[PDB]
């Protein structure tokens with residue numbers, strides 16, 4: 001059905017690097033140059049206080065909407081990824097349901113400033129204290145620590161492209177019908193990533209990448225905190241949370 | 253529902 005569902009030559013792996021990087025550049029949501037430029041645009045003490053005084057439900061709704069916006073770009077990235085549209089719809093859904101949030105969490109390191117420990121949120125940079133009204137301090141600091149750890153690797157845009165492609169194309173996701181097809185696509189995407197690292201003398205980052213359990217822990221924590229919020233404000237979730245967010249994190 | 257729609261919309 002697709003070339004990358006079988007064994008690929010060196011020239012075909014080189015083509016895969018270019019294709020993945022193109023798919024990412026076209027769906028990256030915000031340009032790295034735009035994020036870097038806005039690092040000096042930091043929320044004032046008054047602005048931080050304003051976010052802290054928002055209700056728990058209002059903050060959750062705002063955050064769920066922004067995360068939904070980010071996920072939609074991840075869906076477009078998947079659609080443009082070599083071989084993804086050749087998989088059956090069950091498997092496309094399985095991969096996006098398990099991997100969409102993982103991709104957003106990786107992409108977020110671009111929007112994280114390791115120098116002052118701030119993240120780009122609603123037009124400016126703010127520290128983790130900006131999210132205090134959510135009532136999920138552990139989850140927030142775990143996301144900030146993850147972004148700090150990824151930022152220390154000094155990822156290029158091409159590295160984020162290849163790595164996120166691998167985060168999404170995971171043959172171990174429970175529920176995959178055509179597991180062997182996914183395994184071969186994963187193998188080729190692994191070769192594309194490792195080829196690019198070899199070519200750019202960046203193989204030293206391989207031993208520095210987070211273990212797969214790390215992204216799983218973050219997603220499980222997210223689902224857990226959402227459940228706590230849902231019990232407290234069920235109508236807020238039912239009436240005002242984005243439909244896509246609900247389909248991915250609370251089974252519709 | 254949404255994911256199905258997003259994947260079908262070309």
Ligand SMILES: CCS(=O)(=O)c1ccc(CC(=O)Nc2cc(-c3cccnc3OCc3cccc(C#N)c3)cs2)cc1
Nearest residue numbers: 028029030063066067070107108110111119120121143222
């Ligand atoms: C991605 C492509 S990009 O182009 O790099 C780009 C495009 C647009 C932006 C702006 C933006 O949306 N900022 C945002 C920041 C955070 C955020 C960061 C750190 C900690 N918590 C956060 O949310 C709290 C929260 C609440 C409820 C559950 C969970 C979870 N699990 C998290 C959310 S949304 C940034 C980057």
Ligand code: NA
Nearest residue numbers: 109110112151
């Ligand atoms: Na960063």
